Design a protein around this ligand. Sequence first.
Ligand SMILES: CC(C)(C)NC(=O)[C@@H]1CN(Cc2cccnc2)CCN1C[C@@H](O)C[C@@H](Cc1ccccc1)C(=O)N[C@H]1c2ccccc2C[C@H]1O
Lengths: 99, 99
Amino acid sequence: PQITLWQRPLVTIKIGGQLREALLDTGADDTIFEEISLPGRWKPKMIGGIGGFVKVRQYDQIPIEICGHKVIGTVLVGPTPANVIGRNLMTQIGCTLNF
Amino acid sequence: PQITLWQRPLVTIKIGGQLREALLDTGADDTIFEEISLPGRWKPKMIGGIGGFVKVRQYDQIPIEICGHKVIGTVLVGPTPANVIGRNLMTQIGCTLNF
Ligand SMILES: CC(C)(C)NC(=O)[C@@H]1CN(Cc2cccnc2)CCN1C[C@@H](O)C[C@@H](Cc1ccccc1)C(=O)N[C@H]1c2ccccc2C[C@H]1O
């Protein structure tokens, strides 16, 4: 579908059997969620954003359903005021910016 | 323009007679630049991002040309690792997300 930007670009997702809302964020290179549980090993990682850096866990090859589309990718879990779907996963559902 | 997301969605803009590049960022409600000079009065403002808060100057009704389109809006100036064009200006150039 097409989404205008008068309101935050929120989409419902299913990840690790949990349901969450996340922002389709073209300004984010990666995908990050606050408080969700993922299984398996992970690698520590620090991502930078506006306001500073945050230490997160990096989980690879994680299945995630974005607004109905089933894809798999790297997902970060760590402190964030909003769950974000980055470009790493937006390219998988074929999302584009248009004007 | 349609823009895919395999690479950062950068656009060249002109604001206050200065040229710079900025990220089309659907995850940002506001527009912020670091390292630019704007004229007139402004109001202090705390902005929250992924890594914490940043103190910035808020300038209203500032003309800005984004990828050739001339619009006007609120622009923040303060510490940021990347210039960002938020939803407040993307709606003015009719930018939409599609998938
Ligand atoms: C991978 C990771 C997710 C850490 N990336 C980012 O946070 C990038 C960082 N770059 C920079 C970078 C840093 C390090 C290395 N390369 C690049 C600048 C742009 N952000 C993307 C932003 O869109 C993220 C949002 C997150 C958010 C949404 C809603 C509520 C809270 C947090 C963001 O920063 N939003 C805020 C925001 C942002 C700009 C202007 C106004 C406002 C207000 C608000 O919407």
